[PDB]
Design a protein around this ligand. Structure first.
Ligand SMILES: [Mg+2]
Ligand SMILES: [Zn+2]
Lengths: 515, 139, 315
RNA sequence: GUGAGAAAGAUUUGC
RNA sequence: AAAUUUUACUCAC
């Protein structure tokens, strides 16, 4: 049915592939590809372009963002039980906390400042040294990245050490800054469609457009290329340590450690490789493994191929193609004049995950589709009504609801089928505000968030420290007594007000209610 | 023994960032195991029951959007709408009124939304989310 | 204050260690020839190769579950329960369980399923798959069809597993009109019983798809759909246009979603003026990438859809 | 069902 | 038995 569309269609309406296959096969395949590329028989991993164009950032103060060093996402933490390395799957928050406990540092910035200012690799930083940190930071765990549309065989992703993440944060921040300085396309605040529009403007002069993908992108980006880029932008010893850890990385597949001296393990340094391409020439507009360029004659095309080869961006003969009236970048398809190509495009369907999350996500998807002109508004209204009916048919049963209030949606035992326009204009019952894409979170979302907080990897016995005064800086240090006092004061004030728990706050509702 | 000394062994003071990160229960992830989780123990059913009689009768009534202008289909462009965050005094007052501190802190920061729009008006004014085709204006 | 470009006292030693470590060798420069994108003949060749290599099943095993069987609710429940009893499924706590001891550790036979005439019960089938794999062991009924999800558990003697966990697979059993080798009879009731072995992620992925919304969104701006035969060939005389719905149902049942890869490559084909020689064609060969009857059929019918588009509405 | 331990348990699965 | 190294763990309450 995707084949009989008048316009462009990627077939994104259904969900991506998934399965319970173990990640061992994919990780082994990736490692073998990296080894073969290292041998110098399949693709090119030797960088020959000139990066002297890139500005040096070696004099910038070493700034660390603590917010992005703590997360609920997974990571690998290395311990030594008796005499062997054991890799544990934890959350980035727990891994960073364990790192700071071992090193005995207040914050990650203090830890990096201490690491950079030691007399020798054997000098102790708490209960560890820089040598031990480097040895532990080369260990990776393998998992499977599923639901990637168009990849029936799932790829392998890798969880890294907290120290590796700490160094990569600085490196990638500075690489992103250099990219933003190199061109206006790489600005921090830019959407995919905006980037595609800029690309369309930048390639208008020439006749033919080469829409290219890079094959084996991660396997062909060597530690040498990363070190070259980092020295070009002036990353100091941080870049050297990162390159050393990357060259000596090991992956735990099932129950065995496999050494992978080539590649960068599935998009650890996207910005650095983008720089590896961008600092040698200005004829490309690349975003990791996807790029677009323009040319007029076969000589220019051969020059393009030479530039791609010299920067270790091996062309994908399977997917890369040449067009004259089309422009594909960031999955966004545009005409040569920058207007959106007619058709569904990347429009993605909304699966059934919760009675109200499905409706909210459908409303967001339809708002995006109608704003960009993918479909007219009446079609979106019909589709929203159809989705409400489907959700009613799936969820209106005693398992999920025992209510019969009229204002409720039909999927929760009610009798209200809200119009899409009525929902978008906030002309509805307050219960429907959560279904608005800009409205509060839904009941399902809160329930699932709490249950996730209760999981084995994320469960903790610590007294929660939430509902904090906005004036308190999150960089302030606190003790157990301090958190106890803060919680007691907040609880006392809330009880005095008469509220058992804090009232949820919504920016849009608050602003609208104001006079 | 206290949990502070167990989770932060060897350290007596930690940043509020780390401590808050250790207890996070407001991050939602869209996953395949959603209906199963919602059915388990009738958690969604109980949550709906609780919302209908504890959380619903506290939401202020929001006025509906009225102003709209004539629009015509045009070339794809980017609409930049800058929404400023709460001022300091506003945040203090909202906190003293019993509102969630984390949400107020998140609303402190000014932000800008970049959205692709394929509709334009005579005076080139911004539009609300999903209502560019109808002409509802931010004003 | 420390700066990012700060040079540590151990910089030289780490640089020397990096120097002593292995380095990559320059690779071979590829030769790229740009040609026109593939024509109808190449897609026909790919379809013929799939057909020759794998062949066809005598019946549409689980796709046939998309059409109503000729039994009422009570008859469907009785047939399913008696089939479960006939297969020696353990009965415990009012629910069915399938026990396994030894595995051949070889892939199941793969062929291409013929297309049923239509799939009126697609929404109901997907909802039932979701519900049954969420709560398994007993027959679940819809307005027009029934399903039975049976946990597949190891047999270990006395302390063998009693309750399924998050990693336990399910055998989904459905009913369709008789007339194939999977016929089953009991007390004058006849039905073809077809099974599908799914891991929990697979069943969750299958059950969460919205058939009706997807069909409407596709229908928004699509061209006229031609009638097709049981094998996905253009047949303007004896073909049916409802089989397209069946194809959509197949794409919903295939948890590998190879049709999405075919769709992306076909989009590249339609937007391309010139492609690489002998390499763009290989993007349509995805048999090595998938494994199983349902994924194979989905790939075959995606290629058939591309062929039909190139035939009836050439671009 | 709850807690802990297996390179490990479902927010799994990273940038 | 099947979409076949997957459908498997232990302890205590
Ligand atoms: Mg591309
Ligand atoms: Zn049969």
């Amino acid at each position: 049915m995707w084949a009989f569309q008048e316009g462009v269609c990627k077939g994104n309406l259904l969900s991506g592939p998934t399965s319970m296959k173990a990640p061992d096969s994919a990780a082994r395949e990736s490692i073998d590809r990296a080894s073969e590329i290292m041998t110098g028989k399949s693709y090119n991993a030797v960088h020959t372009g000139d990066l002297s164009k890139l500005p040096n950032q070696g004099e910038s103060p070493l700034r660390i963002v603590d917010s992005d060093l703590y997360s609920e996402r997974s990571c690998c933490w290395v311990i030594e039980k008796e005499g062997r390395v054991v890799c544990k799957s934890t959350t980035l928050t727990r891994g960073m906390t364990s790192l700071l406990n071992t090193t005995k540092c207040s914050s990650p910035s203090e830890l990096i400042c201490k690491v950079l200012t030691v007399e020798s690799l054997s000098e102790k930083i708490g209960d560890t040294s820089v040598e031990e940190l480097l040895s532990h930071g080369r260990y990776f765990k393998c998992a499977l990245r599923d639901q990637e549309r168009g990849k029936p065989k799932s790829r392998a992703i890798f969880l890294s050490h907290p120290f590796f993440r700490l160094l990569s944060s600085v490196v990638e921040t500075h690489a992103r800054s250099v990219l933003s300085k190199v061109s206006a396309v790489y600005t921090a605040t830019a959407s995919a469609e905006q980037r595609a529009m800029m690309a369309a403007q930048v390639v208008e002069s020439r006749k033919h457009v080469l829409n290219g993908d890079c094959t084996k992108y991660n396997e062909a980006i060597d530690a040498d290329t990363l070190l070259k880029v980092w020295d070009a932008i002036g990353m100091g010893s941080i870049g050297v340590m990162l390159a050393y850890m990357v060259r000596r990385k090991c992956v735990l597949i099932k129950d065995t450690l496999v050494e992978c001296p080539g590649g960068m393990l599935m998009g650890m340094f996207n910005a650095t490789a983008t720089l590896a391409l961008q600092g040698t020439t200005d004829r490309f507009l690349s975003f990791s493994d996807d790029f677009i360029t323009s040319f007029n004659s076969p000589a220019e095309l051969r020059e393009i191929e030479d530039l791609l080869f010299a920067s270790c961006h091996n062309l994908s003969l399977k997917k890369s193609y040449i067009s004259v009236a089309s422009l594909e970048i960031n999955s966004c398809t545009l005409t040569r004049d920058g207007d959106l190509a007619t058709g569904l495009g990347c429009t993605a369907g909304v699966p059934f995950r919760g009675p109200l999350v499905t409706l909210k996500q459908t409303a967001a998807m339809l708002s995006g589709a109608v704003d960009s002109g993918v479909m007219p508004f009446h079609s979106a209204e019909r589709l929203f009504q159809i989705k409400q009916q489907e959700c009613a048919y799936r969820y209106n049963n005693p398992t999920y609801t025992t209510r019969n209030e009229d204002f409720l949606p039909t999927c929760l035992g009610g009798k209200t089928v809200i119009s899409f326009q009525s929902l978008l204009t906030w002309d509805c019952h307050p219960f429907w505000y959560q279904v608005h894409p800009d409205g509060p979170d839904t009941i399902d979302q809160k329930v699932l968030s709490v249950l996730a907080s209760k999981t084995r990897r994320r469960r903790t016995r610590l007294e929660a420290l939430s509902d904090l005064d906005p004036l308190v800086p999150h960089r302030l240090l606190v003790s157990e007594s301090d958190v106890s006092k803060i919680r007691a004061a907040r609880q006392a004030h809330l009880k005095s007000l008469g509220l058992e728990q804090p009232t949820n706050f919504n920016y849009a509702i608050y602003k609208a209610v104001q006079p | 023994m206290s949990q502070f000394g167990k989770s932060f062994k060897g350290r007596t003071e930690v940043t509020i960032t780390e401590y808050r990160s250790h207890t996070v229960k407001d991050v939602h992830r869209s996953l395949l195991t959603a209906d199963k989780s919602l059915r388990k123990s009738f958690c969604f059913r109980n949550a709906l029951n609780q919302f209908l009689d504890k959380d619903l009768p506290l939401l202020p009534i929001r006025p509906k959007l009225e102003s709209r202008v004539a629009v015509k289909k045009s070339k794809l462009r980017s609409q930049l709408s800058f929404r400023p965050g709460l001022t300091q005094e506003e945040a203090i007052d909202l906190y003293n009124k019993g509102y969630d501190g984390d949400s107020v802190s998140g609303a402190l920061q000014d932000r800008v939304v970049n959205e692709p729009v394929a509709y334009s008006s005579a005076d080139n004014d911004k539009f609300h989310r999903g209502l560019a085709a109808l002409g509802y204006t931010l004003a | 204050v420390v700066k990012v470009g700060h040079k540590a006292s151990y910089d030289a030693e780490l640089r020397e260690r990096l120097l002593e470590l292995p380095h990559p060798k320059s690779g071979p420069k590829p030769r790229i020839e740009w040609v026109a994108p593939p024509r109808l003949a190449d897609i026909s060749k790919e379809t013929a190769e799939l057909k020759r290599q794998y062949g066809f099943f005598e019946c549409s095993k689980f796709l046939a579950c998309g059409e109503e069987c000729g039994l009422d609710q009570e008859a469907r429940e009785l047939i399913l329960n008696e089939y479960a009893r006939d297969r020696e499924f353990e009965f415990r706590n009012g629910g069915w369980i399938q026990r396994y001891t030894v595995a051949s550790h070889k892939p199941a036979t793969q062929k291409i399923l013929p297309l049923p005439a239509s799939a009126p019960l697609a929404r109901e089938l997907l909802m039932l798959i979701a519900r049954s794999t969420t709560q398994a062991g007993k027959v679940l009924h819809s307005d027009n069809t029934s399903i039975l999800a049976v946990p597949v558990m190891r047999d270990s003697g006395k302390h063998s597993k009693r309750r399924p966990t998050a990693s336990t697979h399910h055998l989904v059993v459905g009913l369709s009109k008789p007339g194939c080798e999977h016929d089953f009879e009991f007390d004058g009731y006849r039905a073809a019983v077809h099974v599908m072995h799914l891991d929990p992620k697979q069943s969750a992925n299958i059950g969460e798809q919205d058939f009706v919304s997807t069909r409407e969104i596709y229908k928004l701006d699509m061209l006229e759909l031609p009638p097709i035969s049981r094998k996905g060939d253009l047949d303007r005389a004896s073909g049916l246009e409802t089989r397209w719905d069946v194809i959509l149902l197949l794409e919903c049942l295939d948890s590998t979603r190879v049709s999405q890869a075919v769709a992306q490559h076909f989009n590249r084909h339609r937007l391309a003026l010139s492609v690489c020689k002998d390499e763009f064609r290989k993007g349509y060969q995805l048999a090595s990438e998938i494994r199983g009857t349902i994924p194979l059929s989905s790939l075959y019918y995606s290629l058939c859809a591309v062929r039909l588009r190139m035939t009836v509405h050439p671009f």
